[model samples]
Target: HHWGYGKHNGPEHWHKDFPIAKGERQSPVDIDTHTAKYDPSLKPLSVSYDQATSLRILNNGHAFNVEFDDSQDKAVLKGGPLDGTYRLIQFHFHWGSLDGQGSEHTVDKKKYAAELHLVHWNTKYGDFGKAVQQPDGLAVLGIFLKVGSAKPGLQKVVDVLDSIKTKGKSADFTNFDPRGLLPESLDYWTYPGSLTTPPLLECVTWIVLKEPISVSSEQVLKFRKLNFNGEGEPEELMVDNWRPAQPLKNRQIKASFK
Candidate 1:
């Protein structure tokens, strides 16, 4: 009712309530690789994921989010344009109805099949909810997904989609290491942007990987099978759940690789 990807409540109309929707640092910007400045100082990303921290997967109305146990620093991310350690709270995906049109961020104006976001919050700010209000509150690792060979790591996630097909449905999803989902290259484009969804907080340090991970078409289509509506409601296929690219404004997009 408040916000959604429809003709009326879609992204184009989000600014009416959330002014930050028109903010200069809004997310999912096009990355012109040639224009991105390579910063040698940007450290290689360091990640440590504890399989046990992966609690369960939930279809939170908007998207399917794999929630994590952030009580401690079991799974954490550091380095890569970040000043402090950030704890992994959850991870989600954004995709479109078709291939080559799903991903939120594009490179050289080319879109991928989908994008994965590993959401983390700065520990210095206490908890994730509190950190969302701070300038350096969150760090979202964006990974592009292209149609290719099947990914075993992703299969584990796909296998659970059926159990949580409807909104608000959840299933226990444990012992899954998020690290296996990352690409071989950690090279990435760094920028200041907001969450791609509602509330659209401009508190994210976006680290979009230059390299993309591979997923078979069969696996990607499984995501489309997800429904936005809950049980007893008219089924609405959960596709095109991505926000269009926002203006880069005066921000400088930095790259970790030359």
Candidate 2:
């Protein structure tokens, strides 16, 4: 009933199920640095996350996600192009089939090995499901992942992938602060976009970081080990789970830094 990253149900056929796929403000747009307008009015991002709020990590058949408890305001994002507090709900990643092209959002038409998404929902809307339907409902922080030395903070996450190798499998992952996963530079590009997946709601305010975090070749390969299929079903490698860039249309990408 839903969609996936396969030939039969991939992004190319997404518009068939979700007509908004061809909408004006679709996500994962190509960010050309030369053309991005710098806005000094954009406030520095305020990320307050409690390590204890991290509940568990699960394989959702699409990608591995680290879900947090959003009932409380412990993990909140504010100050950067956001009017009210946005509660952190979960975080996930999109990687390529090989080492070269993977990330959804590109910088100057250059794709990285992978991309990270930290999903948050506006508290003003009550819940994530309801917020997703509104125009200013969600704020997703996007981080590019490059192939290099193994990131120590990321190693903690990579270590647990084996436990959640199959779909529906999950493991308790706590005391891990999500902020540790970000790059040193908070400089980002902000724009209006939609969820890269099906239902592709155009409710997201995308804040994509300009700098990429590093992950060793060995570390990134672990992600490919995950299967799209659940236990006892035919296996399909969970790689290249990223949606290609959509048309920018009338949207303008604003940068927090010049």
Residues 1-258 of candidate 1 have per-residue lDDT tens digits of: 479998989999999989899998999999998999999899999887754379899998888999899989888889999999899999999988998788999998999999999999999999999999998999999999999998888999999999999989999998888988999888899999999998999999999999999999999999999999999899999999999899999999999998
- Alpha-carbon TM-score of each model against the true structure: 0.98, 0.98
Off by over 4 Å in 1: 50-52
- lDDT per residue for candidate 2 within 1-258, as digits (tens), equals 568998889999999989999998899899999999999999999888753399899999999999999998989989889899999999999999888899999998999999999999999999999999989999999999999988888888999999999999999998788877889998999999999998899999999998899999998999998999999899899999999899999989999997
Scored by lDDT, model 2 comes in at 0.92
Give the deviation of candidate 2 from the true structure as CA RMSD.
1.0
Which regions of candidate 2 fall more than 4 Å away from where they truly are? none
Please report, in order, the local distance difference test score of every candidate based on alpha carbons. Answer: 0.93, 0.92
How many backbone overlaps does candidate 1 show? 0
* Model 2 lDDT at residue 216: 95
